[PDB]
Amino acid sequence: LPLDPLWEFPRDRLVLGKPLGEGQVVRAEAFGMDPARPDQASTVAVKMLKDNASDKDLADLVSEMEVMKLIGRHKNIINLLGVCTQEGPLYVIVECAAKGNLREFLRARRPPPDGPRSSEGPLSFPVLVSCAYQVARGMQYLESRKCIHRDLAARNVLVTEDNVMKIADFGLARGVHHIDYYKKTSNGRLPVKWMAPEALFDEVYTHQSDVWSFGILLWEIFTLGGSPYPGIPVEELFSLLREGHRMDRPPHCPPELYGLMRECWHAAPSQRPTFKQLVEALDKVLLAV
Ligand SMILES: *[C@@H](O)c1nc(NC(=O)Nc2cc(O[C@H](C)c3c(Cl)cncc3Cl)c(C#N)cn2)c(OC)cc1Br
Numbered sequence: 001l002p003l004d005p006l007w008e009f010p011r012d013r014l015v016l017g018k019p020l021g022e023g024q025v026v027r028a029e030a031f032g033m034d035p036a037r038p039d040q041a042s043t044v045a046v047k048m049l050k051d052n053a054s055d056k057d058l059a060d061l062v063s064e065m066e067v068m069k070l071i072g073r074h075k076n077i078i079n080l081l082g083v084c085t086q087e088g089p090l091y092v093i094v095e096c097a098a099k100g101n102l103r104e105f106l107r108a109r110r111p112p113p114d115g116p117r118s119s120e121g122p123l124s125f126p127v128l129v130s131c132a133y134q135v136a137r138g139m140q141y142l143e144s145r146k147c148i149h150r151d152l153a154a155r156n157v158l159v160t161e162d163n164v165m166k167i168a169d170f171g172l173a174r175g176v177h178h179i180d181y182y183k184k185t186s187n188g189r190l191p192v193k194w195m196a197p198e199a200l201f202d203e204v205y206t207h208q209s210d211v212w213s214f215g216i217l218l219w220e221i222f223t224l225g226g227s228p229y230p231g232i233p234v235e236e237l238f239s240l241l242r243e244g245h246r247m248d249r250p251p252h253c254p255p256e257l258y259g260l261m262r263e264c265w266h267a268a269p270s271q272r273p274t275f276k277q278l279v280e281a282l283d284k285v286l287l288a289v
Contacts, residue, residue, distance in 0.1 A: 001085060007069060009033070009082030009093060016046065023061050024050050027096060033081055044081055047092040058090065060173040065092045067171025071145050076138030078158060078168045097158030097166055102131065105159045106225035123224060126289045127163070129257075132221050133282040134165035139214060140275035142170055143207045150174045150205050152213035153194045154220040155187075176203060182234045193228045197241055198269060208269035214278065215264025222253040256285055 015029040028046045032038035047064070049057055068080035084091035099105050111121030135157055142149065149156070149170045158166045181192045181200070196212035198204040216228050229237055229247060246265050249258040260281060266272050273281065 003086055004069075004083070007080070007083045008086065009084055011084040011088050011091060014044075014046065014084070014091070014093070020045060022050065023047050023057065028093075030081070030093065043096045043098075045078075045094050045096040047094065048089055061090060061092065063173055064171050065090075067147070068092060068094070071142070071147060071171065074138060074141040076134045076165055076167060077142065077170065078166045095160075095166065097168075098161040099159035099163070101155050101168075102135075102157040102159055102165065103154035103220060103225045106154070106221065110224045125254075126286065128221055128224075129282060129286045129289060131157075131163075131165050132218055132257075133279065133286050135167065135217060136214065136275055136278040136282055138165065138167040139210060140279050142167065143210070143275050147171060148205050148207060149210050149213070150176070150199070151191055151194060152210050152217060153189075153191070154217050154225065155189060157217070176205065181238075188227070190227075190234060192234055193232075193237060196269070197267065200241065206269060207275065208272050211264050211269075211272045211275065211278070214275070215261045215272075218257065218261045218264065219247055219250060222257055223250045226250070 009030075013031045013033075015031075017027040017029065019026050024047070026046045026048065028044050030042050030044045032040060033042050033044065034040060047061065049061060065080075065083055071077070071080070073079050078094050078097070080092070080094055082093045084093070106123065109122040111123070112118070139149070139152065147170055149167070150172075151169070151174060152167070156167065156169050158168045160166060179192070182190075183192075184190055192200065194213045194216045196205075196209035198206075199209045199212075219228055220226060229240075232240065244267065246262060249255070260273070260278070263271075263273050264278075
């Protein structure tokens with residue numbers, strides 16, 4: 001509740017709109033986010049507390065806000081724009097990504113005799129590689145800021161109107177010591193399927209456990225938004241991970257990209273690439289195509 005003049009934004013310059021998801025996130029119009037253009041409208045996302053409002057919920061949002069302030073700006077993350085902390089409910093104002101999360105972006109754009117482009121879907125291989133590259137660059141930035149994501153997944157990458165990838169929800173209290181591994185979200189997601197083995201079995205989280213998750217995200221990309229470990233119940237996932245099993249190479253995926261996935265899933269975190277190495281490896285592919 002103390003005033004931070006660097007980040008404080010007058011709440012009466014916000015017009016809240018339709019909710020985006022559930023703290024909870026609401027789309028809003030902001031006037032004068034740029035103090036040089038005080039009447040200029042922009043669209044932003046506003047994170048706020050739900051109606052439940054427990055003291056732990058508030059602490060978690062305040063903690064997220066403080067991570068937001070120190071992370072700095074990067075093109076491939078959702079950036080803090082401002083906060084409302086005085087004379088009203090706590091708002092954390094961040095960039096809005098017009099096309100939604102990357103999983104929904106891909107699933108809505110899967111390939112399909114009217115006109116000359118009947119076989120042509122919206123998604124091409126170089127653009128998919130660019131999505132992976134941009135996520136790696138954002139993750140590399142986050143890692144250099146000493147930010148571990150802990151649930152990196154296509155659902156947590158957002159897509160701007162210009163198809164820029166932005167990592168979202170990176171500075172969050174994740175309830176690491178009480179994960180319901182069998183928990184399925186309302187959209188059917190089993191988040192345990194993105195956890196590195198050292199995170200799942202030992203509750204150990206490093207930038208290399210994020211590299212594991214990036215490998216799963218790579219698989220999501222090149223299945224155009226498929227769900228990982230298809231048809232493997234959580235009980236069976238435990239055992240196959242204990243046996244060293246990995247996902248198969250997805251169809252229409254070049255061996256360069258499945259190779260990168262398998263590196264990302266090496267048992268020993270030291271045998272996985274760094275994000276810096278993933279950026280370079282992906283840059284080489286992007287340039288070649
Ligand atoms: C604003 O440009 C805008 N955004 C969206 N969709 C959208 O998802 N915007 C969005 C959402 C954000 O977080 C939410 C909670 C979210 C969702 Cl909805 C789904 N998956 C992950 C997450 Cl984290 C954030 C953030 N932080 C930023 N932007 C529109 O959809 C129609 C429309 C508009 Br104008």
